[PDB]
């Protein structure tokens, strides 16, 4: 009962700006969830958008379904159109 993102992989990830990425990113560092390890990931910069996404969107669920909540809080404030997709409440 916790799988939002996964289902919703395919939302994120053909939608999410190559901006809002950055600012998200960011964002996730600032609540220090993940680690310089998997930040390095999604550093390493790996193609377009559809790339740089899939990393973000799965290194963030890693760190369990706890993350999930920040996740899509900041995304909120961050893109309110994509959001709405994801605007559960």
């Known amino acids: ?12 990830i053909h939608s ?3 901006g809002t990425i950055n600012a998200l990113l960011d ?5 220090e969830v993940i680690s310089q390890e998997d930040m390095n990931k999604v550093r390493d910069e790996n193609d377009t958008v559809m790339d740089k ?14 993350s999930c909540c920040k996740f899509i809080k900041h995304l909120c404030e961050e893109d309110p159109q994509l959001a709405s997709k994801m605007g559960l409440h």
């Open 16 to 18: 999410v700006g190559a």
């Open 27 to 31: 964002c996730l560092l600032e609540d």
């Open 53 to 66: 996404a899939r990393v973000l969107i799965d290194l963030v669920t890693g760190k369990g379904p706890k």
């Open 1 to 12: 009962a916790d799988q939002l993102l996964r289902k919703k992989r395919r939302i994120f």
